[PDB]
Design a protein around this ligand. Structure first.
Ligand SMILES: [Mg+2]
Ligand SMILES: [Mg+2]
Ligand SMILES: [Mg+2]
Ligand SMILES: [Mg+2]
Ligand SMILES: [Mg+2]
Ligand SMILES: [Mg+2]
Ligand SMILES: [Mg+2]
Ligand SMILES: [Mg+2]
Ligand SMILES: [Mg+2]
Ligand SMILES: [Mg+2]
Ligand SMILES: [Mg+2]
Ligand SMILES: [Mg+2]
Ligand SMILES: [Mg+2]
Ligand SMILES: [Mg+2]
Ligand SMILES: [Mg+2]
Ligand SMILES: [Mg+2]
Ligand SMILES: [Mg+2]
Ligand SMILES: [Mg+2]
Ligand SMILES: [Mg+2]
Ligand SMILES: [Mg+2]
Ligand SMILES: [Mg+2]
Ligand SMILES: [Mg+2]
Ligand SMILES: [Mg+2]
Ligand SMILES: [Mg+2]
Ligand SMILES: [Mg+2]
Ligand SMILES: [Mg+2]
Ligand SMILES: [Mg+2]
Ligand SMILES: [Mg+2]
Ligand SMILES: [Mg+2]
Ligand SMILES: [Mg+2]
Ligand SMILES: [Mg+2]
Ligand SMILES: [Mg+2]
Ligand SMILES: [Mg+2]
Ligand SMILES: [Mg+2]
Ligand SMILES: [Mg+2]
Ligand SMILES: [Mg+2]
Ligand SMILES: [Mg+2]
Lengths: 144, 117, 201, 64
RNA sequence: GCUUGACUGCGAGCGUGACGGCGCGAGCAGGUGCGAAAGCAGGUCAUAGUGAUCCGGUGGUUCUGAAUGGAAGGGCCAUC
RNA sequence: UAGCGGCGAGCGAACGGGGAGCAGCCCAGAGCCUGAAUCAGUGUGUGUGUUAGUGGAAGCGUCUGGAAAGGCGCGCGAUACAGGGUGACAGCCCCGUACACAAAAAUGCACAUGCUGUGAGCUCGAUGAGUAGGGCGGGACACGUGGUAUCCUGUCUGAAUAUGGGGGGACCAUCCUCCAAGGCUAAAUACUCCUGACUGACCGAUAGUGAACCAGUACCGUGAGGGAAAGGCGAAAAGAACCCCGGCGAGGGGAGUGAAAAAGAACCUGAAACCGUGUACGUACAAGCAGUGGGAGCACGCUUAGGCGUGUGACUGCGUACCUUUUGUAUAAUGGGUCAGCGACUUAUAUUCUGUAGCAAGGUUAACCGAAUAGGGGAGCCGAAGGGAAACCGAGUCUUAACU
């Protein structure tokens, strides 16, 4: 183990293509660009979504929907997270202390993702049916 | 990490120029001309590795025909007689014998004449 | 897992995972390469065609001269012109993940124990600040090229070793993966072994 | 710098669970009266982007 | 002669298209018409009779509603 | 991202969080208290640094060599093995470096203290009008007049004034929040004509500044302006006394110097095109990409004979260059007189796929702090759940009155 007996893992350091360095390389002359078009040209290439002037798909299709500002202040909570709080209680504010939900989340919902193996009290939150039963099956006290 | 190209460029040019010795004019002196004369020589040689085999066989056969014609039989009948006689002496060796051993060739001719009779 | 202090009958227990782990060369190589990249002062430039001083005037007209069409006296094709992809300053540093660095340090130390390059002592004391006293100590310990790792910076020891090119004295916190590989032997005080074990664990 | 999402494409597509893209159908904005009920009904649910076009949409929606 | 199936929601599966899309469709739910009944009817013997998206308009729908209650506007459905 | 947007091309926030650094004051006036805070200058004292500088360790012998610092051997110093020099590579020859010291005189930034000016503290009053707001036209706000709040105002107008007003993104109500139309204010931030020190996986004379050189010169241009080329004898000039040819030439030959003149100033190394002298071989009845395959003869070496080596190459088979562009080029299609040198898929950030490594239902930190490539920092980002336009529901959801 010296400064001259340290190799990288095999396969970790691929060469890197060099264009226009002769016949043998396989990227000589046109360097993979083919011959005589927009794409060949330096800085050549149509913009993303350009389909040759045909009405592209993003504009051919209609706009739909709106964005709800509520969805951005609404977070789902997994059962796995209910053990990550300090004190057994699971309020919106102690979930923020445990970095489960964002600091600007006002509404929180516990869903049936993962498992809870603990008596947990959930306060001021919403709870799915499936999630309500997993909490109740472990000493749970859901409180509206 | 700036890289000067002079030492590797000189070598690359000298290698070709050494291969172009004996060539006339710009062909032994000038790299642009020399590189094309070396590549062509390579192409011709490669062609000539195959061409030589055809030429030497062509020579042997004309030599065999002459001897065979001298000894009384055409090449065509002669090679058929050696075939029907199971003789597997190749054209290289028949033509050497025709030149250097004219009595041995006579024997090979009578054997061919025999297997045709 | 145990280390025999060279100068004592007594040994020191340490963690197998830090001093006894396998030698992952790839992780060490990635961390030693990053350290050298992190040492680079990436200070250089060239001049692009825009940065070469001169005018934007067409040297000659587009058509009618039998000359090659030109547009700039600063074209990179031209002698005194710009460098086509002129260099700028750049930071060559790499991200090493926290765990990859500790992981390589643990690997390196394990490989020094396997190669008997790690010496452990109760203490490494030079009394006065003199190379002559330390060079005798290292000649009596049979050491020439050696990284001394103490727990506490001894003023006398740092100074006494400063003029010795093959000797470097560091604190437990001053270790780096290259210096552990680079020197032939590593001498670590007992208390330094404690610090490094707590650092790495 | 950051790639700029093509904002017009962000308003026509939404990423599904297996990385696909749902979009509203064309031909249901106006001129609805000459179109059969049956044609209008099949156009009411969101379709998924076909294989030929997922490259265009993904190019336009990098942060999707 | 009687009538409104030129129905509403859906749709196994096929076809035809680079895509956008276009087309065929039993059967299911709801409600209807004709017929004693079996049944037929989701427009016309079929294949042309058409125009994407944007921007708006109209009606419906308390989905959303930038402190909060509303509203504006937006969305969604139908149509221009 | 939310939005803006011929909803095209593109533009692009904030809320809120993590950090750097924080500092608050005054007038719009009176009175009692009075020079009690505060910087401003402007003197002085004591420390601090700058502008010159002082000392600063330790080596000999031998070998090679023109020369020793190199080799070999045996020693010495090191808070100094940073560097630069010296006849080839020096810790110990030199200059220096670490370390220790130093200022008549002037001056900076800090403190203390003194003269001169500025006023706190209390008490009760006071609370910035052609202003806010509006109409018209424009601009600015990410926001293109859009449903458009908010700021600015060219024009026309024009309030309330603490029981009052502004804002909370059309607008209204309620609630909260602040108080415009008068001002000052350090630090964290930006930059480097210039100076000092130090560094560089920066260049090394077609590079690097245009300029390593008497270069913004020569030269061009009415002028604005444009804008070159050009580095290296040697360790030391020891830079060639003297002699000879020559025109008291140029230049050269000797001599001498020097390790070297095969370093002689037209000077280190001294490539290539290009041009010559000499020797070997061929070539004056021979037709073409000039080679290639065969192959005599000649010359020169080898071999102890040996049909092999080198050079040449009569004669002979085959054979229309290269690049580019093209359906296709010997093409009479393009490009190149030749050599040398330079001359083109980069860099930064985002994003995705692959490989590889680390950790793993968790992964990882950014700025910044700094015990400085450590460690700290988990603010955040991604992922572990999706469906739905959305509310919302949730391993299901949407659709529909409800789904086989
Ligand atoms: Mg190929
Ligand atoms: Mg081309
Ligand atoms: Mg083409
Ligand atoms: Mg192409
Ligand atoms: Mg957080
Ligand atoms: Mg340049
Ligand atoms: Mg870090
Ligand atoms: Mg509509
Ligand atoms: Mg029915
Ligand atoms: Mg018809
Ligand atoms: Mg509406
Ligand atoms: Mg509001
Ligand atoms: Mg409201
Ligand atoms: Mg901003
Ligand atoms: Mg001195
Ligand atoms: Mg000294
Ligand atoms: Mg206005
Ligand atoms: Mg206002
Ligand atoms: Mg309050
Ligand atoms: Mg006021
Ligand atoms: Mg230059
Ligand atoms: Mg040179
Ligand atoms: Mg210039
Ligand atoms: Mg120049
Ligand atoms: Mg003379
Ligand atoms: Mg020379
Ligand atoms: Mg010369
Ligand atoms: Mg002749
Ligand atoms: Mg001729
Ligand atoms: Mg011919
Ligand atoms: Mg053509
Ligand atoms: Mg043509
Ligand atoms: Mg041809
Ligand atoms: Mg011709
Ligand atoms: Mg022509
Ligand atoms: Mg031509
Ligand atoms: Mg030409």
């Amino acid at each position: 183990m010296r400064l001259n007996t340290l190799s990288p893992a095999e396969g970790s350091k691929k060469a890197g293509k060099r264009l226009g360095r002769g016949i043998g390389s396989g990227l000589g002359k046109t360097g993979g660009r083919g011959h005589k078009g927009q794409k060949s040209r330096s800085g050549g290439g149509v913009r993303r979504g350009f389909e040759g002037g045909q009405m592209p798909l993003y504009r051919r299709l209609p706009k739909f929907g709106f964005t709800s500002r509520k969805a951005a202040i609404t977070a789902e909570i997994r059962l796995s997270d209910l053990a990550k709080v300090e004190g057994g209680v699971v309020d919106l504010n102690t979930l923020k202390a445990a970095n489960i939900i964002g600091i600007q989340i006002e509404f929180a919902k516990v869903i049936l993702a993962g498992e809870v193996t603990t008596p947990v009290t959930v306060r001021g939150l919403r709870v799915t049916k499936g999630a309500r039963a997993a909490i109740e099956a472990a000493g749970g006290k859901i409180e509206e | 990490a700036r890289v000067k190209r002079g030492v590797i460029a000189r070598a690359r040019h000298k290698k070709i120029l050494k291969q172009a010795k004996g060539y006339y004019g710009a062909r032994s002196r000038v790299y642009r001309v020399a590189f094309q004369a070396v590549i062509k020589a390579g192409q011709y040689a490669y062609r000539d590795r195959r061409q030589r085999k055809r030429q030497f066989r062509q020579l042997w056969i004309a030599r065999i025909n002459a001897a065979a014609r001298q000894n009384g039989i055409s090449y065509s009948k002669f090679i058929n007689g050696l075939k029907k006689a199971s003789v597997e002496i190749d054209r290289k060796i028949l033509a050497d014998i025709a030149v250097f051993d004219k009595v041995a060739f006579t024997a090979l001719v009578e054997k061919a004449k025999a297997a045709l009779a | 897992m145990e280390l025999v202090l060279k100068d004592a009958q007594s040994a020191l227990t340490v963690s197998e995972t830090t001093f006894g782990r396998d030698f992952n060369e790839a992780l060490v190589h990635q961390v030693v390469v990053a350290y050298a990249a992190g040492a680079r002062q990436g200070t250089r430039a060239q001049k692009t065609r825009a940065e070469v001083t001169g005018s934007g005037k067409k040297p000659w007209r587009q058509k009618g001269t039998g000359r090659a069409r030109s547009g700039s006296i600063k074209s990179p094709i031209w002698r005194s012109g710009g460098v086509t992809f002129a260099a700028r300053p750049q930071d060559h540093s790499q991200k090493v993940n926290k765990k990859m660095y500790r992981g390589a340090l643990k690997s390196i130390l394990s490989e020094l124990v396997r190669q008997d390059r790690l010496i452990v002592v109760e203490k490494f004391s030079v009394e006065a600040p003199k190379t002559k006293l330390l060079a005798q100590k290292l000649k009596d310990m049979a050491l020439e090229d050696v990284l001394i790792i103490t727990g506490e910076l001894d003023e006398n020891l740092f100074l006494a070793a400063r003029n010795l090119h093959k000797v470097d004295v560091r604190d437990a916190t001053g270790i780096d993966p290259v210096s552990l590989i680079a020197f032939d032997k590593v001498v670590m005080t007992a208390d330094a072994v404690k610090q490094v074990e707590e650092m790495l664990a | 710098p950051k790639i700029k999402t093509v904002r017009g494409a962000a308003k026509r597509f939404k990423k599904t669970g297996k990385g696909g893209f749902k979009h509203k159908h064309a031909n249901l904005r106006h001129i609805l009266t000459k179109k059969a009920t049956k044609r209008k009904r099949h156009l009411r649910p969101k379709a998924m982007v076909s294989k030929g076009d997922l490259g265009l949409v993904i190019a336009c929606l990098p942060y999707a």
